[PDB]
Symmetry: C5
Subunit: 337 residues, 5 copies
Amino acid sequence: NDPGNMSFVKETVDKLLKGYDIRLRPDFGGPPVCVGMNIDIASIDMVSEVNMDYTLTMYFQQYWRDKRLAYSGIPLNLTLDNRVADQLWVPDTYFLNDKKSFVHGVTVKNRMIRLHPDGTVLYGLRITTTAACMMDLRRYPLDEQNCTLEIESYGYTTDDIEFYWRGGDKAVTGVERIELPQFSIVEHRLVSRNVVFATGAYPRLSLSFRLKRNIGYFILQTYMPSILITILSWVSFWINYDASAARVALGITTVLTMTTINTHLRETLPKIPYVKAIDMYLMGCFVFVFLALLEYAFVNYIFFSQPARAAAIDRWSRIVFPFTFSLFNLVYWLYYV
Amino acid sequence: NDPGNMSFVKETVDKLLKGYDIRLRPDFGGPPVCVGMNIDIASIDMVSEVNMDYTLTMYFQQYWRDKRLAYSGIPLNLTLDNRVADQLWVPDTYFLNDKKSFVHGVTVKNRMIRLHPDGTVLYGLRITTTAACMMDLRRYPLDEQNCTLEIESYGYTTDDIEFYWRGGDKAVTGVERIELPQFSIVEHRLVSRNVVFATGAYPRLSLSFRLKRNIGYFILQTYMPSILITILSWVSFWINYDASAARVALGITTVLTMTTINTHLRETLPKIPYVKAIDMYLMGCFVFVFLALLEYAFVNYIFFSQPARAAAIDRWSRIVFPFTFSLFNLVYWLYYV
Amino acid sequence: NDPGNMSFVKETVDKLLKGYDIRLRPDFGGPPVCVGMNIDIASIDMVSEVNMDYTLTMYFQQYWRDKRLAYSGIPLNLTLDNRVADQLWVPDTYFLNDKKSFVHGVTVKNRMIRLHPDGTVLYGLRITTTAACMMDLRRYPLDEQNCTLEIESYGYTTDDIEFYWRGGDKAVTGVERIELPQFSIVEHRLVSRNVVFATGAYPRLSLSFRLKRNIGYFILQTYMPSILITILSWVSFWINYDASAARVALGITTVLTMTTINTHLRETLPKIPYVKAIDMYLMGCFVFVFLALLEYAFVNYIFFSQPARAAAIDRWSRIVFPFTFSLFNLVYWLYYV
Amino acid sequence: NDPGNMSFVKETVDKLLKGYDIRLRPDFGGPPVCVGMNIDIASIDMVSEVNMDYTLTMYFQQYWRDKRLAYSGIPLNLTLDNRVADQLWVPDTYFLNDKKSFVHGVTVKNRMIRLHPDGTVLYGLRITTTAACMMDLRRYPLDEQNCTLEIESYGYTTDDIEFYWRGGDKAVTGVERIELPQFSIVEHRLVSRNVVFATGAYPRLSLSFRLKRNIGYFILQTYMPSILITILSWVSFWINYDASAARVALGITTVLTMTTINTHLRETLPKIPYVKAIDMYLMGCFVFVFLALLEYAFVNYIFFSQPARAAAIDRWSRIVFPFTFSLFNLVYWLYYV
Amino acid sequence: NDPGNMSFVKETVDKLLKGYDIRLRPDFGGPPVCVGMNIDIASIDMVSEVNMDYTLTMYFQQYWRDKRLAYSGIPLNLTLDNRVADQLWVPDTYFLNDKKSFVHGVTVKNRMIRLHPDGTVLYGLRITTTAACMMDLRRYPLDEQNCTLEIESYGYTTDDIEFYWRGGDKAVTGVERIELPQFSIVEHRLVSRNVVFATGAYPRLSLSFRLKRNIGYFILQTYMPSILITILSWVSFWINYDASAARVALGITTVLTMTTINTHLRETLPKIPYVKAIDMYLMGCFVFVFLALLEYAFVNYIFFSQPARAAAIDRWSRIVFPFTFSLFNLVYWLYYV
Ligand SMILES: *[C@@H]1O[C@H](CO)[C@@H](O[C@@H]2O[C@H](CO)[C@@H](O[C@@H]3O[C@H](CO[C@H]4O[C@H](CO)[C@@H](O)[C@H](O)[C@@H]4O)[C@@H](O)[C@H](O[C@H]4O[C@H](CO)[C@@H](O)[C@H](O)[C@@H]4O)[C@@H]3O)[C@H](O)[C@H]2NC(C)=O)[C@H](O)[C@H]1NC(C)=O
Ligand SMILES: *[C@@H]1O[C@H](CO)[C@@H](O[C@@H]2O[C@H](CO)[C@@H](O[C@@H]3O[C@H](CO[C@H]4O[C@H](CO)[C@@H](O)[C@H](O)[C@@H]4O)[C@@H](O)[C@H](O[C@H]4O[C@H](CO)[C@@H](O)[C@H](O)[C@@H]4O)[C@@H]3O)[C@H](O)[C@H]2NC(C)=O)[C@H](O)[C@H]1NC(C)=O
Ligand SMILES: *[C@@H]1O[C@H](CO)[C@@H](O[C@@H]2O[C@H](CO)[C@@H](O[C@@H]3O[C@H](CO[C@H]4O[C@H](CO)[C@@H](O)[C@H](O)[C@@H]4O)[C@@H](O)[C@H](O[C@H]4O[C@H](CO)[C@@H](O)[C@H](O)[C@@H]4O)[C@@H]3O)[C@H](O)[C@H]2NC(C)=O)[C@H](O)[C@H]1NC(C)=O
Ligand SMILES: *[C@@H]1O[C@H](CO)[C@@H](O[C@@H]2O[C@H](CO)[C@@H](O[C@@H]3O[C@H](CO[C@H]4O[C@H](CO)[C@@H](O)[C@H](O)[C@@H]4O)[C@@H](O)[C@H](O[C@H]4O[C@H](CO)[C@@H](O)[C@H](O)[C@@H]4O)[C@@H]3O)[C@H](O)[C@H]2NC(C)=O)[C@H](O)[C@H]1NC(C)=O
Ligand SMILES: *[C@@H]1O[C@H](CO)[C@@H](O)[C@H](O)[C@H]1NC(C)=O
Ligand SMILES: *[C@@H]1O[C@H](CO)[C@@H](O)[C@H](O)[C@H]1NC(C)=O
Ligand SMILES: *[C@@H]1O[C@H](CO)[C@@H](O)[C@H](O)[C@H]1NC(C)=O
Ligand SMILES: *[C@@H]1O[C@H](CO)[C@@H](O)[C@H](O)[C@H]1NC(C)=O
Ligand SMILES: *[C@@H]1O[C@H](CO)[C@@H](O)[C@H](O)[C@H]1NC(C)=O
Ligand SMILES: CCCCCCCCCC
Ligand SMILES: NCCc1c[nH]cn1
Ligand SMILES: NCCc1c[nH]cn1
Ligand SMILES: NCCc1c[nH]cn1
Ligand SMILES: NCCc1c[nH]cn1
Ligand SMILES: [Cl-]
Ligand SMILES: [Cl-]
Ligand SMILES: [Cl-]
Ligand SMILES: [Cl-]
Ligand SMILES: [Cl-]
């Protein structure tokens, strides 16, 4: 009778679970059971291009109605121990594009079961999942990616289970609180549909983020060293042509440094066959430094018979190379921005 | 009487599982139980030459008949909770060449049990398996590999269980949707046979893929740097022979860069005792740059007494080296393509 | 009767657990259960900037009261086997910012259950948790970070469970015994509050540390090499200006070494998009070495027509560069200390 | 009666397992139970000098007799579901030198239980184990290693259990099909004995392989680069002694390359306190390149006053160095082969 | 009657376990139960300074007396199946300073239960534990470390459980068979005491090893390259001072090689704020090579006006530098040995 009478609550719960068959979904053989889902995104741990996946930690909450769990006489919502979730029926929800996921289990399994007088069940889990995200790196590092989390029922079709976002556009919360050092979340979308396979139509939910990559790290890491190496190559134009060792050493060092930068950058990323934007910039810088070395080679070749022509070539290169490099940078940064 | 009456369905399921012995296969002591298998490949995560394996995520579905599970009066297929699979006999199917594999268990064990009125059981799992694949890298990176997944019964012989691809050549789906950045799937084949061991004959299914390696990454990563270093070595032929430091530095840097490229490339791949195609190309490039350095050494040796001969040697080298390297590249690319 | 009579104690415990419902919290339907918590920190294993987290091993003890477990006639506290914790209600306490935590299980599960005559339960665990800690590295490596451990109830709201630090400021011990090679713990704080989510208000505890980074490692690893490279660059001001190869080699090696140091240091840290203090120092050192190389370029450019001016420029550089670098170091170390 | 009558077989199995005590070994208190063991080696995954261990995948089958499981009236071998193994007594067989081993569990636990009418039990497991193997790398990479797998009973002494290799020399199969890229399996041996510990005498089986390391990888990776660097050092002898920068650069680059090769190779292997064969070869090559540099230093020292002596020294070095290096290689390869 | 009657033994064991309460320790409410412990160290896998820990595999055996398990009429020691350990009381023994430990589980859980007529239980496990060991690397690599394993009861205090080494100083065996390539075990000690915490006094056992680091690897890896680089720097003293490029290149290469060696060695070890012995040696070698380069700088500065003084400085350096470096090595090795 009294809500505080734990004996009465125990009797009510035992009556609820007596004869309860966990093998049967609510309203088995009848209308599909509607499961409304919410996500509270705690954080996005990392976004990996090498593995083409991102790690996501969230509170995943499911909401459905089981008339077998309807109780009367207790005007309270029963928050039960998570272990009771083993004695109930729960949807076979799984993430379609994940690779490794787990439910946290310290100190207890991170699980919540709440029953309502009308038979409504709220079932919450804390899930850290590494979801696969194929990425198009043709504009890297100035690229924008779209990473999705796909939620689907495993065994039951749309004739047995239906999904919806509980709350419309506000079902997924906490996106604005995500701190990604390298990315900024431009937008997120919720999609609900049905996907047909050989075994029938299955409900599907999709939580998609659009990530815009920050460029400051790559400016500090790759572009500035390339510009500095190109200017270092230009330095040889003010050295006298008789100093063969000095200018040849400058050319060799700049060329080898550009090649090492390019190879190291490519080794950092996964083995993709196409050419990226940063690869184009590095190849342009390599062309510039190699042309500077070839210019000195020409000057050394012709400076014995025609010293005036060699001096003129050096003097003209001193102006041509910075101007042409400025034009190359201008067109490059206009194309990719 | 009523398919929508959950009490009747519970009674029927309990009657099916009453007296059910999970230790005995269907038709125990009689004809072998036929199990048909389908695979829906979600993705191929990675292909590693270093570990000689590949990761594969799939929906693995088995189909058999258990007359003990035949039910009447319910004109519906019973999609039961996955936990009921712990109370039923399931085939001891395993992957012969796998190293690590698991079944995804978020938010529940990715498992599906469907019963049919005639006693047919459909049993689905979502499995991520890392299968070993020995690779013949003698034509690397222009090689073509053949990686197989072998499926076999562990304890039961052909007198007890038989395997067949359910649907013939259409048993495996999703192969055309696989996105491997480094490989392209030329073909896939399904094979069914029996393998004899000391304990008897066992059914065996095989799903084999033929992968062709995309060459763009290795063109951008290894071949182009080698060509550029060889051209850089050629640059020394236009430098005056009195500039000993410059030309010796050019030769040294080219030789050392070629050696470092070769060693790094060999370190990237697993330790194999034979020579790869890319190794042949790198050794040829090293020979060319070393011959350039030796040519300068000869010119420096003879340029005091015979300056005209030294100048003639430099002039002839300026033509001979590019032409010979072009011929070497031509024959190399004709041999391996 | 006799406390040493094991049969009497067994009967008492069986009476305690007879009719006990683990699905219901103590005082279910009435006042919330107050759960006090103590932490004895065994060690902070590591602090990772790349992963933005820290590993922490602790003895986490919870203290609550369940009148269902009150016993009389035994004037002793019952230290029971840890397995009995599976037959009792325990709080659904979890860590908000953890990423991978576990309870040690050798030789048995590192778990303690102690019962008191009035029904008080003490429940201890040994937990190794990897808690996330976002770090602001703008003053790196002279930064001061703040890492928190958040403790919260998962299912029950403040209407059911309340948290408090058992012992106040002395509720957490072992902080003074923490030996971090790279950090020193300036202070730790304990905070108790309530956090409101869509499902209601939940209790919250926070154990926060203020970590100060030791600077000796970075002095020995980054700053001293940069200073030595800058002094090496200054060395070229004493070499004769006609030794073009020597001075150009000095400039090239110093500039390239500075760039490689900067790039390696950036690659040792997470891909943050901003500029750190050590990045500013490295950029200053790079500017100094580049200015030295450009100074030699100017001297070589003008040394044929105006040798006296070139000698004067070298002589003035010998004084200006050390003085300017000393001023730069002075202002840098005054700004960041 | 009918072997195909599943009810009769279920009754027989229930009678077999009724009153069965898994805590008691067969013939408890009497003669020891003989367990015969077979191994079908599927593969040897990898051999690690750094970790001093090797990974092995195998089908491990045990054969014993349990009179409690003897059944009559069924002239068939009962292949039972693997789960029945949880209800039977199985030997406590473990691997003495293993470090991390597991039983494959997809799709089910890779376990086989087969019973015979006379109570004979065949129990098979597919096991992957990382077994430690201490290696003597004094003759590395021309070394020959001996790696063993040790099988022992953990709790039962020779008064309770006895091991034997079932089939004798043919107990272990699949050795000839093992494909190790770096090693070749010269021989394998099977040993059976008893080992005395503080608790008594325990049965012991040993499966040992003798592996011979292939040399092709190290020929292409370490020896050839060293030889090429030594020839590069010799190149300086034909350069004129007035080209001080060129010859000094050749000496410096060869010496530094040799040192880096040696240090990298030592870093790849575990921190062993002794000298390997390849270490001896690398030290010899370093001695040769250092002697070449010192020879140029002597020539540059004495070439001003005595040009004829310097030219004679260079001419003699051109012959002495290649010949002495050939002799060194000859004696080195004779000693280690 | 007869011990060979398995039915009688099963009856005896069932009577022993009938009414057995695993929640109560032996002599609950009375005198503390004394637990005697033995360790048979199988191996010490690896000692890591970076992680500051060591991996240890051991047979850990506990010995106690439970009068509830005393049986009569069977003059034998009952070696029971390890699974019966789940039906008995076992001490809550744990390792105070472990980080990740597991009990091996192939083929079965590596566990042993042996009962004696007087109710004495022997309980053995095979445990691989990674125990933290704080190390003082000030005298590294000539350091001597002290790594301990701490064994303690988790829940029971000294009023309930007491620990002692069974066999005194011979309780721990197998120490002399430990093969650490990088360390030699000078001594091992056993300590027994009691530690007071807020919850009471707990028994404590300690097994400590004193490890002395072998110096051969570091002699071959760090000291010899440093000495060789210093001699290489000395080489420049015999080169003519007019060869500016050669001597400046020698100085630059030696200085940069020393810096790279020091930085790489510091990177190998964990980040520590103090200076190690090898750091002192490397800094001394850097000072020597830098002083050689500065000596050449002075010679080049003064060799135009005072050629005789420059020649005298070179000649005196040729003797001073080797002698001073020999003195530095002598004092360094005397200090640290
Ligand atoms: C990352 O990339 C993914 C994949 O490309 C993007 O996901 C797509 O998102 C769009 C919305 O932005 C989806 O389009 C919408 O689909 C809804 C569901 O369609 C299902 O049901 C209808 C019948 O009702 C079927 O015809 C259909 O085949 C599906 O089964 C529609 O209801 C939406 O309709 C809206 O637009 C139409 C006009 O086009 C209007 O008439 C409607 O009123 C309504 O406004 C819409 O079509 C698309 O389906 C998603 N694709 C997938 C594969 O899921 C992510 O958006 C992207 N991430 C970001 C951040 O952009
Ligand atoms: C990667 O590499 C693997 C291994 O080499 C390849 O696998 C082989 O694939 C071929 C098919 O492409 C297989 O050949 C087929 O084998 C079937 C099974 O043979 C067993 O059973 C028959 C009796 O039914 C026995 O006679 C036989 O000895 C075996 O015990 C056959 O049924 C097939 O028959 C077909 O061809 C024959 C002619 O050869 C015709 O007469 C038939 O009518 C029919 O058309 C066929 O022979 C081969 O067995 C596979 N090998 C293994 C070890 O499994 C993969 O194909 C490769 N990857 C790719 C992509 O190609
Ligand atoms: C890798 O390294 C390991 C360790 O060194 C090698 O293992 C040894 O292998 C040899 C065989 O090659 C073993 O020697 C044999 O041991 C048998 C068992 O001895 C026990 O039992 C007998 C009674 O049966 C006792 O007397 C004895 O004390 C032991 O308790 C013997 O039965 C064998 O005897 C055979 O040879 C002798 C002559 O030597 C004859 O007189 C006999 O008639 C008979 O033919 C033999 O002595 C040795 O025990 C193994 N040691 C260990 C520690 O396991 C591996 O062989 C090696 N790997 C490879 C590939 O070689
Ligand atoms: C690595 O480093 C650790 C930590 O420093 C070393 O461990 C210490 O080892 C020494 C022995 O070598 C230990 O000293 C011994 O402690 C015992 C326990 O003391 C407790 O109990 C006594 C009462 O029984 C109390 O008085 C005391 O306060 C403690 O509560 C003592 O029983 C031992 O007594 C012995 O020496 C005394 C004289 O000092 C004699 O009178 C006794 O008869 C007896 O011979 C002794 O004092 C010390 O406690 C250990 N410290 C820790 C923290 O465990 C390791 O030894 C070291 N590794 C190596 C290889 O050396
Ligand atoms: C509490 O509920 C139980 C079970 O219905 C009942 O027996 C008991 O009387 C109730 N308590 C009171 C005070 O009525
Ligand atoms: C459902 O089936 C049960 C068992 O046969 C029966 O008792 C019950 O009356 C049925 N439901 C209805 C509405 O008749
Ligand atoms: C111990 O308690 C049991 C249960 O109350 C009782 O039957 C037994 O007699 C007691 N022991 C003694 C010695 O009285
Ligand atoms: C099968 O065995 C059971 C149990 O002995 C028996 O009741 C049944 O009649 C048998 N089947 C046939 C067809 O005889
Ligand atoms: C073995 O012990 C059981 C149980 O006491 C008994 O029933 C049986 O007769 C004994 N066997 C013999 C041969 O005495
Ligand atoms: C950067 C330090 C350079 C030291 C040169 C010393 C020359 C002294 C000439 C009197
Ligand atoms: N199902 C194959 C089992 C096997 C192979 N080899 C030995 N046992
Ligand atoms: N105990 C907090 C549960 C939660 C957070 N967000 C959503 N649900
Ligand atoms: N069965 C091996 C038991 C053992 C070895 N060492 C100590 N105990
Ligand atoms: N067995 C010691 C338990 C402990 C330590 N600190 C707090 N509790
Ligand atoms: Cl966790
Ligand atoms: Cl998973
Ligand atoms: Cl652990
Ligand atoms: Cl597995
Ligand atoms: Cl294990």
